[PDB]
């Protein structure tokens, strides 16, 4: 058939929000920042003109990383973070987007084919049972019990997502710990031939126009990721995610109710429960069980 | 049918990341650089005005390659690299994108047709065996054992990718070895009629506004390619890539378990194992083997 | 059916790269050039202002072709090439793109219909042979031996492509032979009423901001086309392109193994070999031949 | 069925190139021109400022057509052509694009239905002949011999295309005959209240920044249209366009081999020959004729 | 079925050109005008600066309609037309686009259903006649003779199109009658507190930068609409548009050859003649009539 | 089936024009306004410079709403309307677009299903009648006579559209009643520390650059809505909209000719009459009735 859900629901939603929210926020931040036309501005005395003022501004912006300048007893790490915030944010967005693509384009056909085989075989056995009046699944799940091909990659993807979100949370916390009065700094032109001449003042007060916007972005991203992390933690635990109302209604038999532990069986049960609307026999078994009870 | 995977998984993922990450990084770098509006800025005394200051800036930017100027005892190679970094990065992206396109549009139909023939013939032999109660593949793989049409092109593509990634790694390492205090330089207007006049100062201190951004880009690209290279090295080795649980379950017979070496047979086994969800008999053979055991 | 390959593989790849690489390079060059906002800049003394400085710059840019000015004993050909490089490059891209479109939309239906007729007739004769137990192709290829309708147009297209690539190579070589210190030049306003007045200096030093970018583009295009030319030369030779393992396996007969020379027969064999995955009998004939041997 | 070619090959190709090449060239010219930001620039003495300098520039640009000014003994026709070149070029592109659209959306259904009727009737008569062992077309073509409904519109479209291309060629030749030293001109502000005041100089030297770009465009368009015209001339002649190997192989009869002249019959034969891959009997008749011979 | 032509050919072509040509021309005019960045420019003495010069320019541009200013004994109607030309041109384009949309989405289903009924009934009667060997249409057309539901709306749409094209022609003629030396005008700041102060000159010479471009647009639009009008006049006359070779070949009978006048019958005949390729019996009746004759 | 018209014709056309015309007009107005780059400009004496002149301009633009300034004895309502015209126009466009979307996505399935049931039941009864030789609809319409589910929502939507168009008409009339000489006004900087200093003049004459453009837009929108309103008034009246030639031809019986009043029956008749081309029996009943008469 055509209609099918290759992924889960909570996992798809959490990755979708984790890849969309930072992207939209950074896009809006860039769109609003370009309205001003600049994010760096540094004072210049009235003796200079527009070209050399632009020169000193651009030179101070570029030499934000040179170790022996910018005397502010701060280590230049806050300035590096201020410079690189959009880059690291877009990297974080793309690196959270990657694992869903990897899972979508690596193991999806195996799962889709297995769930298919399950649904046609269940339909066939239901038809055989209904026509008889007028253990293939059990052995198959017993075999998949001993295998761990899919659970290992699922848990690897979940662990990678959890650790990258934790790294994002700690980095945004460190960035938000930055004090507000830690952007203004001194800059100078002391290099080349400009080391002996004294026609320009020594200390220039410069300023990055990023403080409020990037502080709001950092704190909001921190809040959203702290709220998001428990969802990932909960979805990591597979044994408690599966419900026990999946194979309980197939007595017409199968004996796998006490099947637990890290196994492909639980993953198959949860995938079947998620994608169960396509089969026409599960609800009939529900109503038959109600008739019995 | 329609659903089919013409490529591998690890190879497709590694080429996808290798073509996407540099492209996105360079796009973001260009988008952030154009906000300033320039990447070159050179000091001009207050005696001059905007036009002749722009003149000297553009002239120093263009004459970044002339051999008998720019006296900085550095060889001008760092300045050439600073100028040409976006060009070489985009070239590297496109030259890594090329081999996947070549493989996709040269030998994909052969592989798809062969895997098809395999799957319909396996289905037919399974149906014949199941209907009998109530060596075509072996000879075919023996014939493909003697052939080397596909493995030669696969290993050629892998070798080309490996060598180009190694060249990228060494070039980015050389670029990152560039010292931070190696951008400021002197420039002058000594040509034409401007060789006798002395109404302008001789030495002008210029500056490329690219240091921090391109250093971060170079080091991050180096790190990602160093991490990426072992994956390519591992996927190059075909004899250990294939698993021995492919033809082991077809005893209903075939005798090719001890088949190894650089041959089309191993490539066919790995392609079949990757694209095996489409056949409906492999899992039935698994469950039958479990019943026997 | 639907799936079919109307073109070759090496020819399609070579024309695709030859039309894509210059286009992407020129697009990137234009995108990076517009960041500066200009590619011409000419010195103006401080006595003038922005309007008349822009006037002299634009006038010198436009009068780059007038014969009795620009005294630099160079012939103005390098300046013409500097002006017209993007135009000629885009022309070269479009003129290499044209022959593939012409071949795609002139003779493709004939080839597709002929290959069809071949595949259905081969399937029919295979079915007849297999049902018999439980020379149409030969005469057809003999007739196409005497014809030259398709080979003449194929060789015409190949010759046109080869000569245009050779012209591109020689022109890029001539452009790259341009010396680096051959851009700076003198310009003046000596016309109309401005021939008697002496309120402006006579000689103005101007400069095209194109040197490094266009030199890199020219040399890289030269290198890629020199590497590309032997592929076109090799694909021009049709007698050695065809393999002899096409009609050798149809003994169930046909006698055309010693057929050579400039003929439609070789083109038909190579097209059939390229588009052979669609028929289901060729591999069966391979396995039957292996059984015999 | 679905697959069908409503148009010819050479005609479609020639109109496609004639509508694409000028459009792409003018698009590139505009994109490169907007980089400078202007195409008009006129000298202003240092006594004036930016607003009144822009005023005089725009006034001279607008008053490029007033008869009693611009004393250059040239007639102002070259200046009008310089102003209107993009407009006339885009008009020429659209007016060459129109006739193909008119032919596509006026008479295409008639041709498609007629070629259909032909192909099904040929298939039916072939099936009848092959089943008999184990003059509808002739009368139909005889009737269409006396009609001229389609040939008149085809020749009208061809004549319109030929005359418009000839007009384009002559106009581009006239534009290219323009001498290079015929752009600089004098302009003044002598109107309204500015006829008695003498605070501004009388003669201002202005300049259109279009010379080299538009000269290259004009000459290249002239060359391409001169090369293109013989193709249109050749495709105009319908009696020699049709090949005599169309109805020669239908002896199983039809007697129309000596049919010539300006008639719908020749057009139908050429359309059938172009769209002949869809029928499955023509190649069978070729092989049968070879068997006879 | 699917393939059908809901509209005519000449009407569709004329409305398509009438809606496309002005739209493309105005788009190109706007794209070329925005290159300059302004279409208004007014002289300012050197005593003022850029802000107050821009102030006077914008104030004169806005106060182009106030009755008691702009002393040029011209009535301000030419200035209003110069201001509003793009608006009225786009309005004319959209108001010519409207009637085709109205006709397409009001009465098209009725016509399509009627032509369908006609074609299936003709096919059925042809099959009955051919099977008999081995007056529904007449009564239907007689009934539609007395009705006028569709001809009234067709003639209303044609009359609306004709009158709007005539209004466009007369308005463009009036605009083109505008003399070239009728744009320059005087403007002043005499209002508010600026009525007693005398620190600014009284008369300012302003200029609209629209003369040549809009004159060319007006004259070309006038020429194209004058050429277009006779086509609309010809297509308005329905009695002479229908050909008498529609119902003349259905003698196997129907007697409506002498049917004329303003009636739905003529419209149905012309629609059937336009969309007649879909039926397979009309050409058979032609060949049968030729056999009889 | 697939082809169906869920909406009416006059209603769809009127809402389409009412949502398109203001949107296109405001888009063109904005596109033409951004060419100037500003719509506010206020005089500044030559003693000031560009920054403080821009300061006063922006401050006067923002403080267009503060009650205790802008002494012009006008109430500031015209200035508020001048500021908010694009916002209110776009709001009016979207609020007219809303009711069609609401009707399309609320009750369309009910109507489509009912008209379906009608057409299949009519086809079935026609087939039964024609096969008999060789009151379900009446009872259904009698039942829908007593219901008012759809007419209430239709009349609610019509009333909402009518009242919003009336509000638009009155608001545009009020805006057009604005006198032309009511834009110029006085502005000052009297706040903060700028209340004691006297280094700047007190009264500044400012000007909104919107007069002619927005007056034309207001008057044209008023004219189009006044012309549009009677169409809405006419389509509101449902009893006279339905024609009596719908159920009059079904005597083969039904007795509902004298059915009138505000009821679902009239709406169903008008919907059936609009979407009647899909049934094949209505025209047959017309011709049969003509045969009887």
End-to-end CA distance of chain E: 34
Are D13 and C106 a contacting pair at CB < 8 A? Answer: yes
How far is D154 from C173, CA to CA, in rounded Å? Answer: 47
In DSSP terms, which residues pair with B205 in a beta bridge? B186
CB A141 within 8 A of CB A255: no
Residue B41 has its nearest CB partner, among A38, A49, A58, at: A58
C-alpha–C-alpha distance, residues F144 and F266, integer Å: 10
Determine the angle formed by the axes of helices A77-104 and B211-236, rounding to 10 degrees: 30
**Rounded-to-integer distance, Cα A175 and Cα A218, Å:** 7
C-beta separation of F19 from F97 below 8 A: yes
The interface residues of chain C toward chain D in range 105-144, judged by CB-CB distance below 8 A, are: 105-106, 109-110, 112-114, 117, 136, 139-140, 142-143
Q: Which helix (H) or strand (E) holds F37?
A: none
B37 with C42: Cβ contact below 8 A: no
Residues of chain C contacting D46 with CB distance shorter than 8 Å: 47-49, 52
Angstrom distance (rounded) from CA F148 to CA E241: 50
If you ran DSSP here, which 8-state letter would residue F48 be given?
A: S
Q: Which residues, 6 or more positions from C89, have their beta carbon under 8 angstroms from its beta carbon? A: C22, C26, C217, C221
Assess A90–B contact: CB distance below 8 Å, yes or no.
yes
CA–CA distance, E146 with B126 (Å, rounded to integer): 74
Between CA B108 and CA B5 the distance in angstroms is 10
Give CA–CA dist C201/A246, Å, rounded.
94
Nearest residue of B to residue A36, measured between CA atoms: B35
Calculated CA dihedral for residues E235, E240, E241, E246, nearest 10 degrees: 170
* Pairing mode of beta strands D204-208, D185-187: antiparallel
Query: Closest residue of D to C54, CA-based?
Result: D41
Phi, psi of E53 (to 5 degrees): -65, -45
Q: Does residue D146 belong to the interface with chain E, where contact is any CB pair within 8 Å?
A: no
Beta-bridge mates of residue F284: none
Question: Does the distance separating the beta carbons of C102 and D24 come in below 8 Å?
Answer: no
CB contact under 8 A, B117 and C17: no
What is the DSSP track for A205-244? EEEETTHHHHHHHHHHHHHHHHHHHHHHHHHH--TTTS-S
Q: How far apart are CA D54 and CA E41, in angstroms?
A: 8
Other C-beta atoms closer than 10 Å to the C-beta of E142 total: 16
Q: What's the rounded Cα separation, in Å, for the pair C32 and C107?
A: 41
- Alpha-carbon separation of residue D153 from D149, D157, D264 (angstroms): 7, 6, 11
Q: Is B32 touching A (CB cutoff 8 A)?
A: yes
Give the separation between CA A238 and CA A38, rounded to whole angstroms: 49
CB contact under 8 A, C211 and B87: no
How distant, in Å, are the alpha carbons of B110, C179, C284 from that of B150?
9, 47, 20
Nearest residue of chain B to residue A33 (CA atoms): B35
Interchain proximity B13–A105, CB inside 8 Å:
yes
**Could you tell me if E227 lies within 8 Å of chain D, comparing CB atoms?**
no
- Give the number of C-alpha atoms closer than 13 A to the C-alpha of residue E19, restricted to the C-beta side: 15
Extract the runs of DSSP E, i.e. beta strands, from chain D.
40-42, 185-187, 204-208
Q: Which of C31, C78, C21 is nearest to C223 (CA)?
A: C21
Cα separations (Å) of C117 from B93, C123, C279? 43, 10, 12
CA C273 to each of CA A57, B111, C118, D85, F131: distance values in angstroms, whole numbers, following the listed order: 66, 15, 12, 52, 62
User: Could you say which of C65, C113, C189 has the minimum Cβ distance to residue D277?
Assistant: C113
Q: Are strands E40-42 and E204-208 parallel, antiparallel or unpaired?
A: antiparallel
Asked if residues A225 and A167 have their Cβ atoms less than 8 Å apart, the reply is: no
Which of E239, E216, E217, E235 shows the shortest CA–CA distance to E14?
E235
Q: How far apart are CA B275 and CA A116, in angstroms?
A: 16
What spatial distance separates the first Cα and last Cα of chain F, rounded to whole Å?
34
| F63 three-state secondary structure | coil
Is the separation of the CB atoms in E187 and E44 below 8 Å? no
Q: List the single residue in C58, C87, C140 with the smallest CB-CB distance to D287.
A: C140
Residue of B nearest to A84 (CA): B213
Quote the strand ranges of D9-71, DSSP E.
40-42
Buried b (16+ CB within 10 A) or exposed e, E252-284: eeeeeeeeeeebbbbbbbbbbebbbbbbebbbb
Residue pair F12/E105 in contact (Cβ under 8 Å)? The answer is yes
Distance of CA D38 to the CA centre of its chain: 30
Structural resolution in Å: 4.5
Q: Any CB–CB contact under 8 A between C216 and chain B?
A: yes
Three-class SS of chain E: CCCCCCCCCHHHHHHHHHHHHHHHHHHHHHHHHHHHCCCEEECCCCCCCHHHHHHHHHHHHHCCCCCCCCCCCCCCHHHHHHHHHHHHHHHHHHHHHHHHHHHHCCCHHHHHHHHHHHHHHHHHHHHHHHHHHCCHHHHHHHHHHHCCHHHHHHHHHHHHHHHHHHHHHHHHHHHHCCCCCCCCEEECCCCCCCCCCCCCCCCEEEEECCHHHHHHHHHHHHHHHHHHHHHHHHHHCCCCCCCCCCCCCCCCCCCCCCCCCCCHHHHHHHHHHHCCCCCCCHHHHHHHHHHHC
| Chain E residue with the nearest C-alpha to that of F181 | E66
Element (H, E) at A181: none
> How far apart are the C-alpha atoms of C220 and C223, rounded to whole Å?
5
The Cα–Cα gap between D101 and C289 comes to: 56
SS3 A39: coil
Residue E33 touches chain F, beta carbons under 8 Å:
yes
Q: B186 CB near a chain A CB, below 8 Å?
A: yes
First to last CA, chain D: 34
What are the counts of helices (DSSP H) followed by strands (DSSP E) for chain C? Answer: 9, 3
Contacts of residue F36, defined as CB under 8 A and 6 or more positions apart, other chains included, come to E38, E58, E61, F209
Q: What are the CA-CA distances from residue D177 to residues B112, D21, D29, D76, D204 (Å)?
A: 61, 22, 21, 15, 26
> What is the C-alpha separation between A96 and A89, in angstroms, rounded?
11
Q: For an interface test with D, which of C26, C40, C58, C145 has the most D Cβ atoms less than 10 Å from its Cβ?
A: C58
Instruction: Report how far apart the first and last C-alpha atoms of chain B are (Å, whole number).
Output: 34
Beta strand segments in chain C, E: 40-42, 185-187, 204-208
Reduced to 3 states (helix: H, G, I; strand: E, B; else coil), residue C185 is strand
Q: How far is A91 from A93, CA to CA, in rounded Å?
A: 5
Helix (H) or strand (E) holding B63: none
Nearest-by-Cβ selection for D52 from E32, E44, E212:
E44
* DSSP state at residue B139: H
Chain D residues with CB-CB distance to E184 below 8 A: 191-192
CB contact under 8 A, D12 and C143: no
Q: What experiment produced this structure?
A: cryo-EM
**Rounded Cα gap, residues F241 and F272, in angstroms:** 13
In chain D, helix, strand, coil percent, each to 5? 60, 5, 35
3-state helix, strand, coil in chain C (%, to 5): 60, 5, 35
Phi-psi bin for B188: left (phi > 0), alpha (psi -120 to 50), beta?
beta
């Amino acid at each position: 058939f055509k209609g099918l859900r290759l992924e889960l629901a909570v996992d798809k939603m959490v990755t979708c929000i984790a890849v969309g929210l930072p992207l939209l926020l950074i896009s809006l931040a860039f769109a609003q920042e370009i309205s001003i036309g600049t994010q760096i501005s540094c004072f210049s005395p009235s003796s200079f003109s527009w070209r050399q003022a632009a020169f000193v501004d651009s030179y101070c912006w570029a030499a934000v990383q040179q170790k022996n300048s910018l005397q502010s007893e701060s280590g230049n790490l806050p300035l590096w973070l201020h410079k690189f915030f959009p880059y690291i944010l877009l990297l974080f967005a793309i690196l959270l987007y990657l694992p869903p693509l990897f899972w979508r384009f690596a193991a999806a056909p195996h799962i889709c084919s297995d769930l298919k085989f399950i649904m046609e075989e269940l339909d066939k056995v239901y038809n055989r049972a209904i026509k008889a009046a007028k253990p293939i699944v059990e052995q198959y799940l017993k075999t998949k019990k001993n295998s761990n091909n899919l659970i290992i990659k699922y848990i690897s993807c979940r662990l990678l997502t959890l650790i990258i979100i934790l790294l994002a949370c700690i980095y945004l916390g460190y960035y938000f710990s930055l004090s507000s009065l830690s952007d203004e700094f001194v800059c100078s032109i002391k290099s080349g031939i400009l080391r002996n001449d004294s026609t320009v003042p020594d200390q220039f007060q410069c300023k990055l126009i990023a403080v409020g916007i990037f502080q709001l972005l950092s704190v909001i991203n921190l809040v959203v990721y702290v709220l998001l992390a428990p969802v990932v933690v909960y979805t990591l635990f597979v044994p408690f995610r599966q419900k026990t109302d999946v194979l309980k209604v197939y007595e017409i038999d199968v004996l796998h109710f006490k099947s637990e532990g890290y196994n492909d069986l639980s993953l198959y049960n949860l995938f079947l429960e998620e994608n169960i609307s396509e089969v026409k026999s599960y609800k009939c078994l529900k109503v038959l069980e109600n008739i019995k009870s």
